[PDB]
Amino acid sequence: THLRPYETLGAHADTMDGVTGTRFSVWAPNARRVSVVGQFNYWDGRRHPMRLRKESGIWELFIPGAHNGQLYKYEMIDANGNLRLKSDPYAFEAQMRPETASLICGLPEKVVQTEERKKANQFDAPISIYEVHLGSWRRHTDNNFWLSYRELADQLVPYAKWMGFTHLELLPINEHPFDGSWGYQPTGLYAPTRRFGTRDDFRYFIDAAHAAGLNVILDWVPGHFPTDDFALAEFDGTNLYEHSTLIYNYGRREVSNFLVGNALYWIERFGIDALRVDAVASMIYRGGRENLEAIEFLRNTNRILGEQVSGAVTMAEESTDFPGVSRPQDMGGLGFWYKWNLGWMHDTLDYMKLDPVYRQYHHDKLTFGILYNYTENFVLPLSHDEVVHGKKSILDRMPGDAWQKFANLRAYYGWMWAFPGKKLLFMGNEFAQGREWNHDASLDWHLLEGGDNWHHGVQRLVRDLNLTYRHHKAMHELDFDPYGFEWLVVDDKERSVLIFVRRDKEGNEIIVASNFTPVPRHDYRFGINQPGKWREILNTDSMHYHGSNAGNGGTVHSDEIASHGRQHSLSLTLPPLATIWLVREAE
Ligand SMILES: OC[C@H]1O[C@@H]2O[C@H]3[C@H](O)[C@@H](O)[C@@H](O[C@H]4[C@H](O)[C@@H](O)[C@@H](O[C@H]5[C@H](O)[C@@H](O)[C@@H](O[C@H]6[C@H](O)[C@@H](O)[C@@H](O[C@H]7[C@H](O)[C@@H](O)[C@@H](O[C@H]1[C@H](O)[C@H]2O)O[C@@H]7CO)O[C@@H]6CO)O[C@@H]5CO)O[C@@H]4CO)O[C@@H]3CO
Numbered sequence: 001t002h003l004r005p006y007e008t009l010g011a012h013a014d015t016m017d018g019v020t021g022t023r024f025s026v027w028a029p030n031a032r033r034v035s036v037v038g039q040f041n042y043w044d045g046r047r048h049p050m051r052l053r054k055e056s057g058i059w060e061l062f063i064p065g066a067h068n069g070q071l072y073k074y075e076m077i078d079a080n081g082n083l084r085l086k087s088d089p090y091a092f093e094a095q096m097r098p099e100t101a102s103l104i105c106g107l108p109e110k111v112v113q114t115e116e117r118k119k120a121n122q123f124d125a126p127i128s129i130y131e132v133h134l135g136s137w138r139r140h141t142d143n144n145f146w147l148s149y150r151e152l153a154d155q156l157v158p159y160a161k162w163m164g165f166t167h168l169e170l171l172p173i174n175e176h177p178f179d180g181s182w183g184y185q186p187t188g189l190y191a192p193t194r195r196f197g198t199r200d201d202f203r204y205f206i207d208a209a210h211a212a213g214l215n216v217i218l219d220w221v222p223g224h225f226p227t228d229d230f231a232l233a234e235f236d237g238t239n240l241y242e243h244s245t246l247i248y249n250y251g252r253r254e255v256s257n258f259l260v261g262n263a264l265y266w267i268e269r270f271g272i273d274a275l276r277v278d279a280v281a282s283m284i285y286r287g288g289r290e291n292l293e294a295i296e297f298l299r300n301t302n303r304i305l306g307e308q309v310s311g312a313v314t315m316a317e318e319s320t321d322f323p324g325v326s327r328p329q330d331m332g333g334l335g336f337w338y339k340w341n342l343g344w345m346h347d348t349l350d351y352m353k354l355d356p357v358y359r360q361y362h363h364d365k366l367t368f369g370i371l372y373n374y375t376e377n378f379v380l381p382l383s384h385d386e387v388v389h390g391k392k393s394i395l396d397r398m399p400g401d402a403w404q405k406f407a408n409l410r411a412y413y414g415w416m417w418a419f420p421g422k423k424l425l426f427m428g429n430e431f432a433q434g435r436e437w438n439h440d441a442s443l444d445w446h447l448l449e450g451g452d453n454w455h456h457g458v459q460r461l462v463r464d465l466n467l468t469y470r471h472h473k474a475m476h477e478l479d480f481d482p483y484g485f486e487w488l489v490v491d492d493k494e495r496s497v498l499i500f501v502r503r504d505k506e507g508n509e510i511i512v513a514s515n516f517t518p519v520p521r522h523d524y525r526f527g528i529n530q531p532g533k534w535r536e537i538l539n540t541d542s543m544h545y546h547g548s549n550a551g552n553g554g555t556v557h558s559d560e561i562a563s564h565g566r567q568h569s570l571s572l573t574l575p576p577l578a579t580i581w582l583v584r585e586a587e
């Protein structure tokens with residue numbers, strides 16, 4: 001099939017009877033004369049000129065002498081044309097940023113997705129995502145140097161495992177010239193950025209995450225076009241990948257193939273378990289208002305991906321409300337598995353930002369999320385996009401003095417981990433970093449030095465939340481089935497107390513109660529479905545995270561006393577600015 005253009009183009013290693021070498025392949029429909037430079041070729045085009053094939057379009061030439069390990073570029077005349085030293089677009093590795101040349105390397109081996117890594121990707125799974133910018137997670141203390149891929153294999157991977165995440169999500173690791181793009185303005189789409197080491201160093205890093213029982217989600221940018229370093233624009237002299245606001249042309253089957261391959265490339269040749277596409281709204285908008293060319297391309301890919309690599313999922317962030325982004329292509333379209341719930345993020349943060357005394361008027365911000373919960377398969381994200389550009393850290397959004405801010409933050413996490421939808425937390429959120437995220441420095445790990453403090457408390461809470469959320473199927477099995485969620489107290493606006501139930505397929509119930517004001521609530525009676533002995537399995541006010549240790553303090557048995565149109569009732573202590581999770585003890 002014509003499906004994986006990385007398996008044939010690029011710069012492979014082939015044999016031509018005994019004599020060994022490097023079977024090159026580029027792509028230009030016009031051009032007129034393209035050849036190969038490098039260290040095996042003295043960087044001069046009149047030593048190895050390359051021969052065209054007219055039907056397909058690929059200029060090529062086996063070369064007996066150039067090995068895996070030597071630098072190279074290309075050299076072409078174009079539609080008329082000029083002289084251009086073009087970079088291989090299928091460069092599986094790229095030189096350091098002196099000249100940004102390519103490098104002769106093969107395909108890395110091949111990874112078979114396990115059945116356990118597929119099982120961690122499915123709708124009924126616990127999914128907690130640690131999202132990380134590899135360039136600013138951590139840095140060496142003495143010189144502020146990046147950690148390598150192998151150092152991240154030793155430090156980021158165990159830290160994520162211990163913290164209880166199921167997934168690691170990397171910002172784009174495309175090669176790219178500018179740090180401050182974070183990876184969203186790429187040059188080498190097929191090359192693991194050399195900032196952190198070789199391509200095999202990065203492959204080693206993925207096996208390590210895999211060894212630790214982590215899936216790796218990769219941020220994938222098929223919707224951002226290379227605008228820097230002349231790399232992919234006016235390439236052959238005409239407009240191949242580029243069109244005629246410097247966007248892509250997903251027209252030709254060989255711009256499609258380039259992209260479809262790149263998705264397949266990471267999943268198959270590194271072991272990547274999920275891809276996340278950002279800004280689908282900018283991809284399919286800006287005939288109709290739409291961009292029907294890009295709608296077809298996503299719809300296509302997510303069906304191709306669903307049958308080739310049947311276990312690896314896709315996720316999307318769409319900033320309008322294009323309907324059914326996470327619904328099958330046959331009707332609605334797009335065909336992703338998951339979608340980021342930005343609406344939820346905006347609504348709940350707005351709620352958290354409110355002075356607690358004003359919360360009674362904005363109850364709607366917490367209860368609205370159920371309405372549209374079953375229109376998409378949702379990821380509750382607390383992303384990098386939320387903590388830069390003057391938007392503040394998540395911690396600094398909270399009202400109150402220091403202790404009140406932290407208690408607020410803990411309750412919000414308590415609530416978030418209970419609420420229907422998968423989970424995503426950006427690095428530094430877990431220890432309540434005070435400052436906005438700075439891509440040019442390490443995170444504020446200095447906060448965690450010295451005596452045990454409030455940041456230790458939040459980090460502990462995130463790990464307990466992760467471990468409690470995994471474990472109990474009620475917390476994660478039925479995110480997308482109305483059966484998995486039922487309000488117990490939706491309408492206590494006055495006191496800002498919200499209670500609801502989570503449910504597994506067996507029908508076990510976990511009660512989540514949030515008190516969003518610093519007024520302690522004693523003897524708060526509410527109705528329940530399953531009478532019996534009840535017990536706290538989670539309490540954001542526990543002194544373990546530096547709360548006041550307010551709580552129910554033991555087993556609590558219910559009463560046959562009606563409440564909220566229900567036959568039996570629990571009467572509980574609700575701690576101030578706090579959520580608690582209750583479980584039913586078996587009889
Ligand atoms: O420079 C020689 C250096 O070469 C090799 O470094 C590699 C390394 O593998 C990677 O770190 C990477 O370097 C990156 C950095 O990671 C990136 O953050 C940035 O670094 C800047 C820093 O942000 C900034 O602090 C400062 O760095 C100063 C630093 O304060 C001093 O410690 C001093 O560094 C010297 C070291 O003491 C010494 O070990 C040696 O370093 C080698 C290293 O052995 C080797 O691994 O010499 C350096 C002097 O360079 O001075 C530096 C100033 O450079 O400034 C830098 C730059 O803005 O920069 C690079 C991004 O390319 O890649 C390098 C090389 O490929």
Ligand SMILES: OC[C@H]1O[C@@H]2O[C@H]3[C@H](O)[C@@H](O)[C@@H](O[C@H]4[C@H](O)[C@@H](O)[C@@H](O[C@H]5[C@H](O)[C@@H](O)[C@@H](O[C@H]6[C@H](O)[C@@H](O)[C@@H](O[C@H]7[C@H](O)[C@@H](O)[C@@H](O[C@H]1[C@H](O)[C@H]2O)O[C@@H]7CO)O[C@@H]6CO)O[C@@H]5CO)O[C@@H]4CO)O[C@@H]3CO
Pocket residue numbers: 363364365367368369370371487490491
């Ligand atoms: O703009 C959206 C919505 O905003 C306001 O709704 C509040 C509501 O006031 C709160 O009490 C709470 O709603 C809770 C309920 O307490 C809880 O029972 C459950 O709701 C379910 C209902 O039991 C059930 O009726 C059904 O709702 C259907 C129903 O056929 C229609 O009502 C329809 O809703 C539309 C309304 O016609 C329209 O008024 C507006 O809704 C407003 C609402 O006016 C206002 O009070 O638009 C909606 C479009 O949906 O459709 C729904 C099904 O989609 O199913 C619900 C869901 O389980 O859960 C809710 C949600 O937590 O919170 C909401 C939101 O702030």
